[PDB]
Amino acid sequence: GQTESDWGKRCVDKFDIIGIIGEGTYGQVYKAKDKDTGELVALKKVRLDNEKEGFPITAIREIKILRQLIHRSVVNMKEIVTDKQDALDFKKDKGAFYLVFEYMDHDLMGLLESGLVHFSEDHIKSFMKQLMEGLEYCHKKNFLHRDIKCSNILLNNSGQIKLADFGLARLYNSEESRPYTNKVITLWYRPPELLLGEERYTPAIDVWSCGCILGELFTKKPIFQANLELAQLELISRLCGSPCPAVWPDVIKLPYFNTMKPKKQYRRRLREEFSFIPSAALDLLDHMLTLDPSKRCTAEQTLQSDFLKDVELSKMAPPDLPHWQDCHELWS
Amino acid sequence: TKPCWYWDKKDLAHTPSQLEGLDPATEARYRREGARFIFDVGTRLGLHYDTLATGIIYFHRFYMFHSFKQFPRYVTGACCLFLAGKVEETPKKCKDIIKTARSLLNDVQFGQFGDDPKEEVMVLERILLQTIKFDLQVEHPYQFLLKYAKQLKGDKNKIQKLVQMAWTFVNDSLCTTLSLQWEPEIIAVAVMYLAGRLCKFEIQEWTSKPMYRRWWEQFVQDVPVDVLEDICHQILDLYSQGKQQMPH
Amino acid sequence: MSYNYVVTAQKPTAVNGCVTGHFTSAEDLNLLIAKNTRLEIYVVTAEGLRPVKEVGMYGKIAVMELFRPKGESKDLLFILTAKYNACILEYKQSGESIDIITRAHGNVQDRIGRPSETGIIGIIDPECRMIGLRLYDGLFKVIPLDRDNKELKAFNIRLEELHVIDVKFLYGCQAPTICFVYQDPQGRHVKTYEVSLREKEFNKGPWKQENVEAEASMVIAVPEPFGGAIIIGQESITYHNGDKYLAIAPPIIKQSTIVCHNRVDPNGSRYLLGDMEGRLFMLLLEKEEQMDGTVTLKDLRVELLGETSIAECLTYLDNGVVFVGSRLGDSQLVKLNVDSNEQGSYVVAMETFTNLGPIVDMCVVDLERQGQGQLVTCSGAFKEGSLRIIRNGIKLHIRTVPLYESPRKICYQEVSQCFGVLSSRIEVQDTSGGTTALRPSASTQALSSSVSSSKLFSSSTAPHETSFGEEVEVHNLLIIDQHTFEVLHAHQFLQNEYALSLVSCKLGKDPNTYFIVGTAMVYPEEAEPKQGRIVVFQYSDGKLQTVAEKEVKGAVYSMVEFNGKLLASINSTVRLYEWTTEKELRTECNHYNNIMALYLKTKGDFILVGDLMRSVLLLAYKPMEGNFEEIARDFNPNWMSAVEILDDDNFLGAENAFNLFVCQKDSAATTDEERQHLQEVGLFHLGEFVNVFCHGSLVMQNLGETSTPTQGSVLFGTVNGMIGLVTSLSESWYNLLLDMQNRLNKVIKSVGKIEHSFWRSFHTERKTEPATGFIDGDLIESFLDISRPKMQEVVANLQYDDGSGMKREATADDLIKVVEELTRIH
Ligand SMILES: Cn1cc(-n2cnc3c(NCc4nc5cc(Cl)c(Cl)cc5[nH]4)nc(N4CCOCC4)nc32)cn1
């Protein structure tokens, strides 16, 4: 037994809380160290205090989905711990639960937002291949992360990449068309089909978000930055072309197609405005940022590309982090 | 065991004199000035030729550890010759060297000796012995130039013209950093190599291996032609720079 | 939620650029000096410079070039800011009122593009056909210089070579031709392209590409007589023009890197060069002319003229004078003589322009108990390093104490009537195996001197090998008198040991006041230092005595006194030491949840931690448990440069992107998550790089309590010499002054038609947000300079809080009293 099979019976007393590290999907993420093992772990709180519906269903999804997923590029939920169990009467226990994850060294957001790190072409290949291998694994298991952002992309100093938050993760079925929440991805990474109101969306919603991250590694700046969905669709049209029935036959089915019209019927300028990107990556970026989700490439097809097909995960070319004594003031 | 007294040509750009703001031309000038100063002073005192070079080599080695701006060149050169006299068993009194120095130096140059010229020299002897690490025994290319010429057989007049011309090149090479770049045996071969080209001599014919086109190898082993051409280039730089012409 | 107020006490003094042209009139020769966000217009005379106009711009001046198109009487000015604001300006003088007219304006930022490594480059075609901009890798932006292009619209030409070093518009070409040095994995090369405004694309260049030096630095557009270009590197200077190729390799330029250049003769016969060691060279172009049918280059020559200030820009004016614009030291006007002086130098200084340079550290001290206060700063680097004592003068009086080495950190100890200054000098591995300094400095010219004899690191199995010619930094602790500013003592630290932090305080129950230095063992093989020392000194009877040493496993980036205990940051750790009765340091508690704990501030039991990333953290020392406790952290990632505590709920920080922000604790909420969340409530793009925050003020302090609109005083020094002041406001004063800014912005015309809200908007490479919680005091204090009709436009419909409890409308003179009271804080 043991070997992380029995869950919920261990208490949070065995973990010393270092502090809060950031805001997660539904609750804020804290960092801690195990007393017995000495390992740094990431915890996420579940209140369970709301006697309205008891245990949150969005948490039940992340517990159900994450215990099935096991991959080198996915943060694995280590265990689940609870608060102190009050008295002999199970009725008096108002304690909350905590999800125990593996702790990573840095986050893609903190690295890029600070402006310290530099990504070479070999670093992006090591980054994107691990990112696409994990996404292909979860897409093969019919799961949708629906919240691909730099804050959920974690990195160790060795060069290993892992995806983090699965609270907004749902199950996908092509046969069964079940309506989901139309707004789900950060506006800067939201696919054009979700902007136009598609409630029954494909796994290609994560492919578009990761495509915006691929281009974000070459410019160190997010591609489409807008405060409104219509303004976001305009920036997408200025680069990838305006959504039209010619390049997107199923765009008419989308509800907001007549409602959310771009300023002009722009032509596709993606290859023009990204001429500085290597040829191997521009072909990958062009397909990942395709308007039609049925014409957009899959996770497996990105791994079968000249940019990623022959990349070896044994190298794991870590991203350059600045050193010290050669920084700040007039040093170098 | 014994310290190393040889650097590379590229290292001369990092002498204490260079690193204190002195330009390469000035330090080279200050070295020729100090070398000719030691040469002329000891010549006036009737000193042996080995004594002159020993002080010049002490002088060259000294400003590899110190700067010309902090130690006056002519005060240091007098101390080297004074020590070289006691080293090479050709001693002269310190007052005799100071007297000769005043003869060859103007009022401006002699001001380096301060109010007490003798004391400024006697004091510097401690730092000189410490800087040279008490490695007093120094050999010069003269004895090797003679050791190699005796093994040559042929026209006595042609060999004698080769020796004196090479000997002149050794006297001129003292003004340079060649004393620090290469061992004295290689310098003696290079001056034979230079005097052979100018005199149009086939030195190989006078050796025990008249066919050995690398005549220099029978004297000094493991010497490429690149080194000989490099040394010849440095010696001839003095002749083209100064007003003296090649002996020929 | 928070309200703050920022004013400029000292304008930027470091010269970031200098140009010569004909801006005011076609006859006068003008020298337009560019400091950060400031433009100074001068008139060159036989005696010196004559000021004519100084204007402020709502942007950091990156590109500044003078040009004269076909049909213009005098040269026009083109300026591109750091935020990509481009504009063309004209000089207009109506008697005594001098105003600068914005002929054209626009923003040339592209939605997508990787910013280049060598920075923004701006070049203008010799025929004034187009403006060439290199803003992104693989993109060359062209603004066609048409008379109707008042919006400065531009198109992008694709660039095959992604990594470019420098580019200029070539002279003597039939079609507009650019010459650039680029770097690919095969080394660096020089290439040429022909720009076609009609086709909007590149054509094949005139002369071919050749493999050049691996450290090729600058491109010099040789004028029409000679033609072509000159490439400056580290060891060789090369001239390329058509089939002609020239290469000179002097041994003198290898000693120091050449960084700037300027042409003396407009035909291109003579050029100026400058080194990092202040050395000045002259690049001579020999002519071979035979009925003018050739004018080819015979050879190139470089001669050492003398030493100037470490200049970012050189410009040769008329009558033999050159303006030496320095960023690391004082700018100067130097005279170039045909005669060498008694030292062999051909350069003689005429005037000295005080430049605070990089203000690495500073401390406010009331030396004379006047109530005014004086500010002593560590200013300059290398040979231009110095101490600056700044006081309010009844303008400003600044006294300079040259150090001739780089100052690091400063602290004042009244018990010894002296200052503590950390300093570093550069020595080079000589032929003796040791090192020899290039110039004497304060650490060598100290009255008494000492060297740390510590064996704490013993042999540390690290006898690193040293080769000849390698630069090494020698760190020292300087003891400087408060009256004479004479170097009383200098303590030289261990080999390869860097001095990083310095504090003066008493500890525990020990009555002796100590100087404490936090150090680090710096080796190039180490990415992060893993060795360091915290050493305690006592200055007594003119000599420094080593009291105690504590070995740490990292770099002691910062130290501070905490209730008689020493709070020190060691790499990612923030540690609190206790001063035992045995006169030694003892560890009490630790905190580790950091990346690189850099800047530290304390207040009571509260601790503000400024890390490299992600931002600022609050630590509270809990005396009951005896261990630290995290309260709240700013979760938005920022690269911190200096932190400061305003009050018990507000915190002030500065980031590397020239931005100031203010965090606040979410009051005392009921949720544990709300309290632990430091919320950024203030945002403001300063435009300067803040290195040190310091509490205090140079104004007279009246112990009598006066209900002043400002509360608190925080001074800061920047890299460009700018010194500012931060203060808090009430919500009534914030809304009152903020409403004036919107009224002042609609009234005041800015240089280049730059929006004030766009300039002060929080700006990084990734996010741009509007300013909040900050009042641009430089805009409010401009109310005392606008004309009376504009004042009535500001005070119209404006409702004031006159007296007590009444919302009465303000008179224009009521606003003049408010601004004049705010002008008294500096
Ligand atoms: C769901 N899940 C999460 C993790 N996970 C593991 N490791 C980290 C990690 N490590 C970098 C890091 N950033 C820090 C910031 C601070 Cl202020 C401090 Cl004190 C310590 C920090 N460490 N960051 C984050 N993010 C969560 C949400 O927003 C931002 C980043 N999630 C992490 C595992 N599963």
Rg of chain A on CA atoms, in Å? 22
Kindly state whether residue B10 falls inside one of the protein's structural domains.
Answer: yes
Domains, chain C: 1-14+356-728 (2.130.10.10), 15-355 (2.130.10.10), 729-826 (1.10.150.910)
Structure tokens at A244: 């039209």
CA-CA distances (angstroms) from residue A93 to A43, A52, A59, A80? 21, 16, 19, 17
Residue A106 in marked binding region: yes
C712, C647 Cβ separation under 8 angstroms: yes
CA-CA distances (angstroms) from residue C410 to C390, C502, C537, C601? 14, 7, 15, 16
Question: What residues does CATH 1.10.510.10 cover in chain A?
Answer: 106-312
User: Using the beta-carbon criterion (under 8 Å), do B21 and C428 form an inter-chain contact?
Assistant: no
- Report the relative pairing of strands C723-728 and C659-665 from DSSP bridges: unpaired
Residues after which chain B is discontinuous, using a C–N cutoff of 2.5 Å: none
C-beta neighbour count of C266 within 10 angstroms: 10
Nearest to B19 among C251, C304, C430 (CB): C430
- Amino acid A307 reads F
Contacts of A215 in chain C (CB under 8 A): 112
Kindly state whether residue B42 falls inside one of the protein's structural domains.
Answer: yes
Omega before C614 cis (within 30°)? Answer: yes
Kindly state whether residue B246 falls inside one of the protein's structural domains.
Answer: no
Structure tokens at C766: 């990734």
| Closest C-alpha to ligand 1, atom 17 | A21
* Claim to verify: residue B20 and residue B89 sit in the same structural domain: yes
Q: Which residues contact C554 (CB under 8 A, 6 or more apart)?
A: C520, C528, C529, C530, C531, C532, C570, C571, C572, C573
Q: Phi/psi of residue A302, each to 5°?
A: -70, -35
Report the distance separating Cα B216 and Cα B224, nearest Å: 9
* Claim to verify: residue B154 and residue B228 sit in the same structural domain: yes
C757, C789 Cβ separation under 8 angstroms: no
* Claim to verify: residue B157 and residue B110 sit in the same structural domain: no
Contacts of A28 in chain C (CB under 8 A): 673, 676-677
* Claim to verify: residue B119 and residue B144 sit in the same structural domain: no
Kindly state whether residue B232 falls inside one of the protein's structural domains.
Answer: yes
CA angle C562, C645, C710 (to 5 degrees): 135
User: Using the beta-carbon criterion (under 8 Å), do C431 and B21 form an inter-chain contact?
Assistant: no
Nearest to C765 among A23, A218, A221 (CB): A221
Report the distance separating Cα C598 and Cα C609, nearest Å: 8
Asked if chain C contacts chain B via 3 or more Cβ pairs within 8 Å, the reply is yes
Q: Which residues contact C360 (CB under 8 A, 6 or more apart)?
A: A329, C378, C379, C407, C408, C409, C691, C692
SS3 category, C745: helix
Q: Which residues contact C631 (CB under 8 A, 6 or more apart)?
A: C618, C619, C620, C665, C675, C676
Nearest to A250 by CA among A184, A285, A204: A204
Report the distance separating Cα B39 and Cα B168, nearest Å: 13
* Claim to verify: residue B148 and residue B81 sit in the same structural domain: no
Report the distance separating Cα C735 and Cα C756, nearest Å: 18
User: Using the beta-carbon criterion (under 8 Å), do C136 and A28 form an inter-chain contact?
Assistant: no
Please say which residue of B92, B110, B137 terminates a domain: B137
Q: Could you tell me the strand order of the sheet in which C627-634 lies?
A: C597-603, C606-611, C616-622, C627-634, C677-685, C659-665, C650-655, C640-645
Report the distance separating Cα C217 and Cα C222, nearest Å: 16
Q: Phi/psi of residue C694, each to 5°?
A: -150, 125
C517, C499 Cβ separation under 8 angstroms: yes
Q: Phi/psi of residue A182, each to 5°?
A: -60, -45
Please say which residue of B102, B137, B172 terminates a domain: B137
Report the distance separating Cα B110 and Cα C739, nearest Å: 80
Report the distance separating Cα C634 and Cα C559, nearest Å: 22
Name the one residue in this structure whose structure tokens are 């080297």: B80
If residue C618 lies in a helix (H) or strand (E), which one and from where to where? Answer: strand C616-622
Contacts of C612 in chain A (CB under 8 A): 114, 116
Beta bridge partners of C278: none
Question: What residues does CATH 3.30.200.20 cover in chain A?
Answer: 10-105
CA-CA distances (angstroms) from residue B237 to A273, B9, B230, B240, C765? 60, 15, 11, 5, 58
Q: Could you tell me the strand order of the sheet in which C565-570 lies?
A: C556-562, C565-570, C573-579, C585-591
Q: Which atom of ligand 1 sits closest to the CA of residue A107?
A: 11
Beta bridge partners of C397: C391
Report the distance separating Cα C753 and Cα C755, nearest Å: 6
Report the distance separating Cα A142 and Cα C798, nearest Å: 62
Residue A180 in marked binding region: no
Give the distance from CA C158 to its chain's centroid. 33
Structure tokens at B145: 């130039």
Class level of CATH domain A10-105: alpha beta
Q: At what angle do helices B24-44 and B73-87 cross, to 10 degrees?
A: 50
Count of domains forming chain B: 2
User: Using the beta-carbon criterion (under 8 Å), do B7 and C251 form an inter-chain contact?
Assistant: no
Please say which residue of B97, B114, B137 terminates a domain: B137
What DSSP designation does C656 have?
T
Report the distance separating Cα A109 and Cα C56, nearest Å: 36
Does the beta carbon of C691 lie under 8 angstroms from any beta carbon of chain A?
yes
Report the distance separating Cα C209 and Cα C213, nearest Å: 13
Q: Would you tell me which residues 461-500 of chain C have a C-beta closer than 8 angstroms to some C-beta of chain B?
A: 468-469
Report the distance separating Cα C269 and Cα C288, nearest Å: 12
- Report the relative pairing of strands C347-353 and C49-56 from DSSP bridges: unpaired
Contacts of A112 in chain C (CB under 8 A): 766
Q: Phi/psi of residue B227, each to 5°?
A: -70, -45
Task: Return the CATH number at B229.
Answer: 1.10.472.10
Experimental method: X-ray
What DSSP designation does B237 have?
H
Distance A153 CA to ligand 1 centre (A): 9
Report the distance separating Cα C482 and Cα C377, nearest Å: 13
Structure tokens at C464: 């690193």
Nearest to A22 among C110, C113, C635 (CB): C635
Give the distance from CA C345 to its chain's centroid. 30
C554, C530 Cβ separation under 8 angstroms: yes
For residue B119, what are the domain limits?
3-137
C325, C17 Cβ separation under 8 angstroms: yes
* Claim to verify: residue B96 and residue B173 sit in the same structural domain: no
* Claim to verify: residue B90 and residue B210 sit in the same structural domain: no
C331, C313 Cβ separation under 8 angstroms: no
* Claim to verify: residue B66 and residue B43 sit in the same structural domain: yes
Nearest to A253 by CA among A263, A266, A243: A243
Report the distance separating Cα C801 and Cα C817, nearest Å: 14
- Report the relative pairing of strands C573-579 and C565-570 from DSSP bridges: antiparallel
Structure tokens at A132: 């696409």
Q: Which of these is catalytic: A34, A49, A86, A147?
A: A147
Give the distance from CA A139 to its chain's centroid. 13
HEC string of C560-610 equals EEECCEEEEEECCEEEEEEECCCCCEEEEEEECCCCCEEEEEEECCEEEEE
Report the distance separating Cα C736 and Cα C734, nearest Å: 5
| Closest C-alpha to ligand 1, atom 6 | A103
Is residue C48 exposed (0-12), middle (13-18) or buried (19+ Cβ within 10 Å)?
Answer: middle
**How many angstroms separate the CA of residue C416 from the nearest CA in chain A?**
30
User: Using the beta-carbon criterion (under 8 Å), do C469 and B13 form an inter-chain contact?
Assistant: yes
Q: Which residues contact A230 (CB under 8 A, 6 or more apart)?
A: A195, A260
Chains that touch B (3 or more CB pairs under 8 A): C
Residue A199 in marked binding region: no
User: Using the beta-carbon criterion (under 8 Å), do C431 and B11 form an inter-chain contact?
Assistant: yes
CA-CA distances (angstroms) from residue C169 to A152, C130, C232, C286? 47, 10, 16, 22
Structure tokens at C238: 């090369």
- Report the relative pairing of strands C448-451 and C487-492 from DSSP bridges: parallel
CA-CA distances (angstroms) from residue C445 to C414, C436, C471? 23, 15, 21
Structure tokens at B117: 């010229």
A34 catalytically annotated = no
Report the distance separating Cα C338 and Cα A54, nearest Å: 91
Q: Which residues contact C373 (CB under 8 A, 6 or more apart)?
A: C364, C365, C366, C391, C696, C697, C698, C699, C701
* Claim to verify: residue B133 and residue B10 sit in the same structural domain: yes
User: Using the beta-carbon criterion (under 8 Å), do A276 and C113 form an inter-chain contact?
Assistant: yes
Q: What is the CATH number of domain A106-312?
A: 1.10.510.10
* Claim to verify: residue B86 and residue B17 sit in the same structural domain: yes
Beta bridge partners of C97: C94
Contacts of C523 in chain A (CB under 8 A): none
User: Using the beta-carbon criterion (under 8 Å), do A18 and C592 form an inter-chain contact?
Assistant: yes
Report the distance separating Cα C675 and Cα C664, nearest Å: 10
Distance A163 CA to ligand 1 centre (A): 12
Nearest to A324 among C528, C691, C766 (CB): C528
- Amino acid C258 reads I
Report the distance separating Cα B194 and Cα B164, nearest Å: 12
- Amino acid C653 reads G
* Claim to verify: residue B7 and residue B124 sit in the same structural domain: yes
> Distance between the two ends of chain C, CA-based, in angstroms?
26
Q: Could you tell me the strand order of the sheet in which C543-552 lies?
A: C497-505, C514-521, C532-540, C543-552
CA-CA distances (angstroms) from residue B122 to B94, B127, B218, B233? 8, 10, 45, 38
Kindly state whether residue B147 falls inside one of the protein's structural domains.
Answer: yes
What DSSP designation does C799 have?
B
Kindly state whether residue B222 falls inside one of the protein's structural domains.
Answer: yes
Ligand 1 binding pocket (C-beta < 6 A) is A 19, 21-24, 29, 31, 42, 44, 75, 101, 103-104, 106-107, 109-110, 151, 154, 164-165; C 593, 614, 633, 635
What DSSP designation does C175 have?
S
C226, C295 Cβ separation under 8 angstroms: yes
Q: Which residues contact C720 (CB under 8 A, 6 or more apart)?
A: C12, C13, C14, C16, C35, C36, C327, C688, C689
Distance C555 CA to ligand 1 centre (A): 25
Give the distance from CA B152 to its chain's centroid. 25
SS3 category, B126: helix
Report the distance separating Cα C347 and Cα C466, nearest Å: 36
Contacts of A219 in chain C (CB under 8 A): 112-114
Rg of chain B on CA atoms, in Å? 19
A170 sits in the region (left: phi over 0; alpha: psi -120 to 50; else beta) called beta
Beta bridge partners of C81: C61
Give the distance from CA C438 to its chain's centroid. 26
Name the one residue in this structure whose structure tokens are 């979760």: C635
If residue C167 lies in a helix (H) or strand (E), which one and from where to where? Answer: strand C164-169
Report the distance separating Cα C168 and Cα C190, nearest Å: 11
**How many angstroms separate the CA of residue B20 from the nearest CA in chain C?**
5
C292 sits in the region (left: phi over 0; alpha: psi -120 to 50; else beta) called left
- Amino acid B76 reads T
In chain B, where does DSSP find H-type helix? 24-44, 49-62, 73-87, 94-104, 107-110, 117-131, 141-149, 156-173, 178-181, 184-198, 225-241
Instruction: Kindly provide the b/e burial profile for residues A133-165, where b requires at least 16 CB atoms within 10 angstroms of the residue's own CB.
Output: bbbbbbbeeebbbbbbbbbbbbbeeebbbbbbb
C-beta neighbour count of C546 within 10 angstroms: 14
Q: Which residues contact C544 (CB under 8 A, 6 or more apart)?
A: C450, C477, C479, C489, C491, C515, C537, C538
Kindly state whether residue B247 falls inside one of the protein's structural domains.
Answer: no
Residue A27 in marked binding region: yes
**How many angstroms separate the CA of residue B71 from the nearest CA in chain C?**
14
DSSP track, C311-329: EEEEEE-STTEEEEEESSS
Kindly state whether residue B34 falls inside one of the protein's structural domains.
Answer: yes
Residue A16 in marked binding region: no
Structure tokens at A34: 């195990």
* Claim to verify: residue B142 and residue B111 sit in the same structural domain: no
Give the distance from CA A157 to its chain's centroid. 19
**How many angstroms separate the CA of residue A164 from the nearest CA in chain C?**
17
Is residue C299 exposed (0-12), middle (13-18) or buried (19+ Cβ within 10 Å)?
Answer: exposed
Q: Which residues contact A279 (CB under 8 A, 6 or more apart)?
A: none
Nearest to C721 by CA among C15, C186, C178: C15
Q: Which residues contact C748 (CB under 8 A, 6 or more apart)?
A: C756, C779, C782, C786, C790
